[PDB]
């Protein structure tokens, strides 16, 4: 049974040991590089592989096509995933005829996601275990083959429960491996009704809220105990960590937050009183509770703030360097109305944001990014996040004046980026979907797909390369100077506010606008290049909700990443014309508008126009934002997008 | 009895546990400052001292005169040192009436 193993940690080591005990012919193991700064309390899968002689590798991204090809040449039979920190997609899972089996450390479907141990300790559970399950596209949604359960005593700590989970995993694997080897696989369906998916946890959660019950706080301390970072508490402006505490009787005659005794140290809670047995302050050694209290200096009566008041987060400031435009005036809608957010804007007009000019926390300044460099420089130092949504996307400027796609697109954005590395700020740079050019890779991946452009003599590729080198400068700046950034690529964001430009000027960014123009002045539907090409659009609400939580960095999950905000689904070649009459069934006028005839131009021969147009609408990967971070699946539909864009466009025209 | 134990590594915890079972009144423990990371292959005596509740101290620089006077006022009768990496000179050697013992793990003097 030539098998492929993705292993790490003690679970990975024990899985390799059990697989070799059972007699699996492991072809190769994929592991992770050593953690830069951590505690080496767990075994090394790489060392185990080296001793056993099985070849081991640590790819940066195992989902690259090259590694899939290597695995395929390895001729997999079954894939085993023992505590792999990364995610493996169907590209690899389909190379195993027997399939892929993942070993999770929770009683599935309860406590899905990452770090089941710490999470079940936070909520104070008393019965967990290990579970082997199938691997599908939805992570942790496979039929349970075997599932052992072990009990948690109140004295159990992180390392003890880790050891118990490891032992339970060994016992489970001993009675399951022969079954898989001989083809006996049992399938117990996961109940989605009782499924809770807990995401990744960060030290920021380790704050000890004193208004919470003493028992809950005790579970919080024991969840992240040695050798985990530990509890997080603050006295004044000094951090101290609780390594061991126990709950005291709820009976008390003191107010919440008042320390009742320092020897031994005992703090009060909303109900109950936590007693700090062992603690450590800042960067030092763990002292006694009384010693810790003496070192900190708090005495009987002193109250400690549960969280340092950073002026109620001070309303994180967003500097949008184009607002009157399409993306800017919708993101401004999203973060002004909903949530607190303070936003500063700078464009050459206020036509689209006239409903925010008198808003309490919107600071608009008219200007240009070329004459008002002083204003921008001052407002990158004062603000917190920067979004340069200045666009030169018009092809007319590509072809007529390519010396303006450089002095304004490249040179000015480069100046703006260097304001964010000088003042240590965060820049969310809008990349384009044109960086891929004429790439032919089905899905335009963010980290696997190649970028193809035409020769130098074509002056229309200077925008793709100018905006492609700006992403390679932000990446370089974020590795040598630690610039905090995020690169989002909007493919086909369309919605009501896109552009008018007196019938799109000559046709720049035409898309659907010319079709709406046809639906008013009795014009036939022209079929350029025969209309065979399919197009996939994206509702502006979807992109804005996906871009809202790029600013709202959840646990700093994807910083220094690239996110393609598009709809791989929602394809429309002829269905584009389908919902024209039927979608327009809620019309209140029911008068004139002269329903245009369905013009048909099936003539394929277009050699006079010339080949090389290249389909503008190509598939997005939507994988680094769908589940990995931002947890963003494009829900909407294909219906309401058009059914609202057409209505708004018609309402904006006075006509009669 | 009243004893001062300089402890580190695993044998430091072992000796602390052995003396606590024996019934030695450990006055204070002096502990090395934790390096950011070299290798976490051993336990820390500070953890054990905190769990047992007996006081432990970690001076940044043991050569400061104030710490010398503090050690003098604590008045240790017997000092047990297990791999203490700080420097002890004759200045400290005359404030310990019974002396101290150091544990070396090779064929002396080689």
Q: What is the DSSP string of A259-321?
A: --EETTEE---SSSEEEEEEEEESSS-EEEHHHHHHHH---TT-B--SS---SGGG--EEEES
Q: Would A118 be classed as within a structural domain?
A: yes
Experimental method: cryo-EM
Which two structure tokens, joined as six digits, stand for A94?
Answer: 């389909």
**Is residue A309 in a domain?**
no
SS3 A409: coil
Burial category of A361 from C-beta neighbours within 10 Å (exposed 0-12, middle 13-18, buried 19 and up): middle
- Is beta strand A233-235 parallel, antiparallel or unpaired with respect to B2-6? unpaired
- Distance, CA of A530 to CA of A600 (rounded, Å): 9
Helix (H) or strand (E) holding B28: strand B25-30
Strand bridging mode A144-147 / A131-134: antiparallel
A215 lies in a domain? yes
Assigned token pair, A403: 């010396």
- Cis peptide preceding A264, ω within 30 of 0: yes
Distance CA A80, CA A7 (A): 8
Q: Which of A4, A11, A232, A35 is nearest to A116 (CA)?
A: A11
| Same domain as A319, residue A431 | yes
CATH number of the domain to which A112 belongs? 3.40.50.12230
Q: Are residues A249 and A383 in the same domain?
A: no
Helix (H) or strand (E) holding A648: helix A639-652
Query: Quick one: A552 and A637 in the same domain?
Result: yes
Taking CB atoms and an 8 Å limit, are B47 and A226 in contact across chains?
A: yes
Alpha carbons A128 and A110: distance in angstroms, whole number: 9
Tell me which DSSP letter residue A207 carries: B
Contact B56 A227 (CB under 8 A): no
Please indicate, yes or no, whether residues A362 and A409 belong to a single structural domain of this protein.
Answer: yes
Rounded Cα distance, A356 and A345, in Å? 11
Q: Final residue of a domain: which of A304, A325, A353?
A: A304
What 3-state DSSP class applies to A559? Answer: coil
Show Cβ contacts of residue A205 under 8 Å, excluding neighbours closer than 6 positions. Answer: none
Residue A86 within a domain: yes
Chain B residue with Cα closest to A279:
B50
* Residue A262: strand pairing partners: A265
In Å, the largest CA–CA distance within chain A is: 92
Three-state secondary-structure class, residue A59: coil
Count the domains in chain A.
Answer: 2
A274 Cα to chain B: minimum distance (Å): 16
8 Å CB contact between A24 and A79:
no
Residue A286's DSSP bridge partners are A280
Rounded Cα distance between A480 and A482, Å, is 6
Decide if A285 and B46 are in contact by the 8 Å CB cutoff: yes
Structure tokens at A505: 């000027």
Handedness of CA A104, A108, A109, A111 (dihedral sign): negative
Q: Is A285–B40 a contact, with Cβ atoms under 8 angstroms apart? A: no
Pick from A389, A388, A461, A393: which is nearest to A426 by CA? A388
Residue B88 known to bind ligand: yes
Domain boundary residue among A281, A304, A327? Answer: A304
Contact status, residue A432 vs residue A493, Cβ threshold 8 Å: no
Distance CA A377, CA A370 (A): 12
A628 within 8 A of A475, measured Cβ to Cβ: no
Contact A565, A540 (CB under 8 A): no
Task: Count CB-CB contacts under 10 A for residue B75.
Answer: 12
DSSP state of A616: S
* β-bridge pairing A273-281 and A286-288: antiparallel
DSSP, collapsed to helix, strand or coil, labels residue A252 as coil
**Taken in order A436, A438, A628, A2, is the CA torsion positive or negative?**
negative
Residues with Cβ within 8 Å of residue B91, at least 6 apart in sequence: B68
SS (H, E, C) A164-202: HHHHHHHHHHHCCHHHHHCCCCCCECCCHHHCCEECCCC
Domain co-membership, A116 together with A259: yes
Answer whether A363's CB lies under 8 Å from A375's CB: no
Count the alpha carbons within 13 Å of A125 in the hemisphere toward its beta carbon: 18
Tokens 């592991």 sit on residue: A31
Q: Do A259 and A325 belong to one domain?
A: no
Question: What separation in angstroms does the CA of A501 have from each of A505, A507, A514?
Answer: 5, 9, 12
Contacts of B31 in chain A (CB under 8 A): 285
Question: Which tokens go with A90?
Answer: 């169907």
- Residue A20 tokens read as 């070799």
Q: Which residue of A has its CA nearest to B36?
A: A37
* Cα–Cα distance measured from residue A442 to residue A281, given in angstroms and rounded to the nearest whole number: 54
> Which CATH number does the domain housing residue A395 bear?
3.40.50.720
Q: Which two tokens stand for residue A16?
A: 């390799």
Q: Collapsing DSSP states into helix, strand and coil, what is residue A236? A: coil
The answer to whether residue A640 is catalytic is no
A577 within a domain of the structure (yes/no): yes
Give the integer Cα–Cα distance in Å for A378 and A562: 28
Q: Do A244 and B50 touch (CB under 8 A)?
A: yes
Instruction: Tell whether residue A233 is among the known ligand binding residues.
Output: no
Closest Cβ–Cβ partner in B37, B40, B46 for A286: B46
Residues of B in contact with A277 (CB under 8 A): 50-51, 53
Q: Map residue A561 onto helix, strand or coil.
A: coil
- Write out the H or E segment, with its range, that includes residue A387: strand A385-387
Together in a domain, A528 and A456: yes
Q: Which of A304, A329, A344 is the last residue of a domain?
A: A304
Q: Can you tell me the distance from the alpha carbon of A382 to that of A334, in angstroms, rounded to the nearest whole number?
A: 22
Name which of B37, B55, B58 is nearest A37 (Cβ-Cβ). B37
Number of Cβ pairs closer than 8 Å across A and B?
Answer: 49
**Does residue A434 have an active-site annotation?**
yes
Q: Are residues A407 and A298 in the same domain?
A: no
Check A342, A412, A434, A617 and give the catalytic one.
Answer: A434
- Which residue shows structure tokens 């040179």? A411
Question: What gap in Å lies between CA A99 and CA A94, rounded to an integer?
Answer: 7
Task: Looking at the structure, tell me whether residues A188 and A328 fall in a common domain.
Answer: no
Q: What is the DSSP string of A583-601?
A: STT--S--S-S-PPP----
Q: Do A109 and A131 reside in the same domain of the chain?
A: yes
Sign of CA pseudo-dihedral A155, A157, A159, A161? positive
Shortest Cα distance from A51 to chain B (angstroms)? 20
Determine whether the annotation assigns residue A535 to a binding site.
Answer: yes
**Structural domain boundaries, residue A284:** 1-304
Q: Are residues A293 and A369 in the same domain?
A: no
CB contact (8 A) between residue A288 and residue B56: yes
Angle at A611 between CA A605 and CA A613, to 5 degrees: 120
Same domain, A115 and A171: yes
Q: Which residue of A has its CA nearest to B30?
A: A285
Distance CA A16, CA A53 (A): 12
Q: Which of B32, B45, B50, B57 to mutate to test the interface with A (most CBs of A within 10 A)?
A: B50
């Amino acid at each position: 049974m030539k098998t492929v193993v993705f292993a790490y940690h003690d679970m990975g080591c024990l899985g390799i040991e059990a697989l070799l005990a059972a007699g699996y012919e492991i072809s190769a193991i994929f592991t992770h590089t050593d953690n830069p700064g951590e505690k080496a309390f767990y075994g090394s899968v790489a060392r185990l592989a080296a001793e056993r002689g099985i070849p081991v590798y640590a790819p940066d991204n195992v989902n690259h096509p090259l590694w899939v090809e290597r695995i395929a040449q390895l001729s997999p039979d079954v894939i085993f995933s023992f505590y792999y920190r990364h995610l493996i997609y169907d590209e690899i899972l389909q190379l195993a005829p027997a399939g892929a089996f993942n070993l999770h450390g929770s009683l599935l479907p309860k406590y899905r996601g990452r770090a089941p141990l710490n999470w079940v300790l936070v909520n104070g559970e008393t019965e967990t275990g290990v579970t082997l399950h199938r691997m599908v596209k939805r992570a942790d949604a496979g039929a349970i083959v075997a599932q052992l359960r072990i009990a948690i005593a109140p004295d159990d700590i992180a390392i003890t429960l880790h050891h118990k989970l490891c032992h339970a995993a060994r016992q489970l694997l001993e009675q399951t491996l022969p079954a898989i080897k001989h083809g006996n696989i049992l399938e117990i369906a996961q109940r989605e009704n009782e499924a809770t998916c807990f995401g990744r946890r960060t030290p920021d959660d380790s704050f000890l809220e004193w208004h919470k019950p003493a028992s809950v706080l005790h579970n919080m301390v024991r969840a992240v105990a040695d050798p985990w970072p530990g509890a997080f508490s603050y006295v004044g402006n000094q951090k101290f960590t609780v390594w061991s505490s126990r709950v005291h009787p709820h009976a008390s005659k003191a107010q919440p937050g008042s320390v009742i005794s320092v020897a031994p140290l005992l703090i009060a809670c909303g109900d109950g009183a936590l007693e700090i047995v062992t603690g450590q302050a800042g960067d030092g050694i763990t002292m006694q509770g009384s010693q810790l209290a003496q070192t900190l200096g708090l005495v009987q009566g002193s109250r400690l703030n549960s969280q340092p008041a950073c002026t109620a987060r001070r309303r994180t400031r967003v500097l949008i360097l184009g607002v009157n435009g399409f993306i800017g005036n919708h993101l401004t809608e999203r973060l002004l109305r909903e949530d607190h957010y303070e936003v500063y804007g700078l464009d050459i007009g206020s036509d689209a944001i006239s409903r925010f000019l008198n808003h309490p926390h919107f600071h608009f300044v008219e200007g240009d990014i070329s004459i008002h460099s002083e204003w921008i420089e001052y407002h990158v130092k004062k603000c917190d996040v920067v979004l340069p949504l200045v666009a030169i996307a018009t092809p007319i400027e590509y072809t007529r004046n390519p010396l303006r796609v450089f002095e304004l697109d490249f040179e000015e954005n480069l100046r703006i980026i260097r304001y964010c590395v000088k003042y240590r700020k965060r820049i969310i740079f809008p990349s384009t979907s044109e960086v891929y050019g004429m790439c032919s890779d089905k899905y335009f991946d963010e980290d696997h797909s190649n970028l193809i452009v035409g020769p130098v003599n074509k002056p229309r590729w200077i925008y793709s390369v100018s905006k492609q080198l700006l992403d390679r400068v932000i990446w370089a700046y974020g590795e040598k100077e630690g610039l905090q950034f995020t690169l989002f690529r909007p493919f086909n964001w369309m919605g009501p506010r896109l552009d008018n430009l007196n019938a799109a000027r000559i046709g720049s960014s035409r898309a659907i606008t010319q079709l709406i123009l046809n639906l008013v002045e009795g014009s036939p539907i022209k079929l350029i290049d025969g209309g065979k090409q399919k197009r996939c659009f994206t509702d502006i609400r979807d992109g804005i909700e996906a871009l809202y939580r790029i600013i709202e960095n959840a646990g700093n999950r994807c910083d220094g990443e690239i996110i393609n905000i598009g709809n791989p689904e929602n394809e429309a070649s002829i269905e584009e014309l389908g919902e024209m009459l039927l979608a327009s069934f809620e019309k209140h006028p029911l008068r004139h508008h002269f329903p245009p005839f369905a013009g048909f131009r099936v003539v394929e021969s277009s050699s006079y126009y010339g080949k090389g147009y290249q389909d503008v609408e190509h598939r997005k990967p939507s994988i680094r934002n769908a589940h990995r971070c931002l947890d963003w699946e494009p829900k909407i539909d294909m219906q309401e997008t058009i059914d609202e864009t057409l209505d708004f466009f018609l309402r904006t025209v006075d006509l009669t």
